């Protein structure tokens, strides 16, 4: 019986009165578009926004940590080289703006060297995040902004094929270029190689030796969160698939790093724990279409001019439960993101990484995407403040979430008296 | 994964109340907390909230008369009420932002007279 249900439970009877009215329904949809906007639109002001880019530099951070002490060399195969030094640039690399692949004889491997071709694909991920992250991210809901990303790599050193034509596609390695495209977010992205050799003894050349440069020119790069999270799912699972060996330097004083030498998935808990907010990232952005897909701003009442019909005239509800839903989701896992990193709850080795290294800067802040000869062994990524910020936007989202819920509950009693 | 409440009353226009809130660790550490407020004839209403390192923000019903507190060593949430109204009148209950699933039985704050 339900009088003596709606006794029990004072706050199921407002429900239904809610339920029942138009103008209440209807301001419950309002909501449901002003909070939209809140987390698709915005960028500050939103959860959703933060739990992205919080996942996003966790990644980025976690390769400014590592990256100067990380092994990398032999040839394009990835076979053992007998005497190549390969340099990629704009990398965090020790007291330097480079990395430098000069690990000869080793097979490349698992805690081995990264072969180059697992480095070419780690940097090019790399140079496309800290580009994007520097000009800022878009909001959830803009999925056709692109960027343009440039980015060089040398090689030297006796049997050197590492920047040869048959690598990479140019026809002429001294001024020869190569256009090629690819389809990725459906986005067409162009890419321009062109080559150059530097000899020996020529004019400004510091390095003895004679090298050639590569260059890559990336026009029309989805800068979407979609297409940014694939990039760092790329560098963070490059990283752990190739899990190369490692050994560090620690400063005198400063934090201690455990263990100094190994490799590099070894850190498993750092590891798991990216992987998952970038898992939990995809998930959330996901949710963007549902949004769009389930518009709430048609107004909704009664057939020819009678009475609204809870039971009858209540077909928008299952697209107004699934917005509600979708919208709660994207909350819920902003807020699972931040949890998975915030060192408030971690412990051990894992909390000593996050509060000593990645949630941490060494450069004289300086902007982001920036790599100084100072950024390696820190995240330089932002994430102590992205952490603040998330909270602080779920904070301001106090109002948001109980009209989302309070839609939620609507639409659900509607679904329900329409069966 | 619990939320005790406790503090209310009843108490004069005028007056002044402090609430209190028992959360688990699990719930409140690491993790912006808030208080919320379920007045007769109305839905679950919120009414401030407070981040981990310690930044409170307020709904427009009640900002400038409530102070919202936390005590990170006790997993303790605080809401100072002053110059209590009728209309604050209501079942005041805290939580974690975003909202745990289950809700504590809340605290009754009547303001009357």
């Known amino acids: 019986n339900l009088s003596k249900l709606l006794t029990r439970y004072s706050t199921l009877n407002t429900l239904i009165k809610l339920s029942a009215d138009p103008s209440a329904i209807n301001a419950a949809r309002e909501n449901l578009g002003a909070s939209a906007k809140n987390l698709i639109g915005d960028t500050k002001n939103s959860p959703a926004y933060q739990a992205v880019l919080l996942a996003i530099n966790a990644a980025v951070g976690f390769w400014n940590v590592l990256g100067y002490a990380t092994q990398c060399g032999g040839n394009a195969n990835g076979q053992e080289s007998t005497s190549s030094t390969t340099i990629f640039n704009n990398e965090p690399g020790y007291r330097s703006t480079s990395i430098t692949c000069s690990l000869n004889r080793y097979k490349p491997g698992y805690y081995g060297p990264m072969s180059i071709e697992n480095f070419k694909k780690l940097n090019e991920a790399y140079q496309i995040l800290q580009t994007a992250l520097n000009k800022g991210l878009p909001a959830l809901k803009e999925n056709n902004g692109t960027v343009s990303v440039t980015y060089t790599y040398t090689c030297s050193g006796e049997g050197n094929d590492n920047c040869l034509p048959k690598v990479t596609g140019v026809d002429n390695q001294n001024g020869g270029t190569k256009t090629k495209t690819q389809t990725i977010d459906g986005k067409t992205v162009t890419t321009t190689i062109s080559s150059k050799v530097v000899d020996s003894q020529a004019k400004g050349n510091t390095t003895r030796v004679s090298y050639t440069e590569i260059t890559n020119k990336l026009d029309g790069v989805p800068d979407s969160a979609q297409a940014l999270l694939a990039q760092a799912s790329t560098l963070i699972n490059t990283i752990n698939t190739a899990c190369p060996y490692f050994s560090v330097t620690n400063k005198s004083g400063g934090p201690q790093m455990e263990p100094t030498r190994g490799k590099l998935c070894g850190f498993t808990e750092e590891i798991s724990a990216i992987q998952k907010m970038i898992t939990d990232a995809q998930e959330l952005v996901n949710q963007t279409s549902v949004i769009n897909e389930h518009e709430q701003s048609t107004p909704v009442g009664g057939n020819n001019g009678k009475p609204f019909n809870p039971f009858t005239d209540a077909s928008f509800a299952q697209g107004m439960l699934a917005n509600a839903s979708a919208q709660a989701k994207m909350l819920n896992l902003a807020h699972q993101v931040g949890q998975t990193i915030n060192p408030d709850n971690l412990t051990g080795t894992f909390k000593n990484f996050v509060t000593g290294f990645l949630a941490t800067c060494n450069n004289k802040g300086s902007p982001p995407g920036t790599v100084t000869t100072q950024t390696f062994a820190s995240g330089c990524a932002y994430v102590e403040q992205t952490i603040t910020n998330l909270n602080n936007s779920i904070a301001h989202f106090g109002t948001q979430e109980q009209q989302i819920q309070q839609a939620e509950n609507i639409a659900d009693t509607l679904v329900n008296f329409g069966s | 994964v619990q939320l005790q409440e406790s503090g209310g009353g009843l108490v004069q226009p005028g007056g002044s109340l402090r609430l209190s809130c028992a959360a688990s660790?699990?719930?409140?550490?690491?993790?912006?907390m808030g208080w919320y407020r379920q007045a007769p004839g109305k839905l679950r209403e919120w009414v401030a909230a407070?981040?981990?390192?310690?930044?409170?923000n307020y709904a427009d019903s009640v900002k400038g008369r409530f102070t919202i507190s936390r005590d990170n060593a006790k997993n303790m949430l605080y809401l100072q009420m002053s110059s209590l109204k009728p209309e604050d009148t209501a079942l005041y209950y805290c939580?974690?932002?975003?909202?745990?699933?289950?809700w504590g039985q809340g605290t009754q704050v009547t303001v009357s007279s």
């Open positions: 407070i981040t981990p390192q310690g930044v409170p």
């Open positions: 939580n974690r932002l975003p909202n745990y699933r289950s």
């Open positions: 660790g699990s719930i409140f550490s690491g993790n912006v």
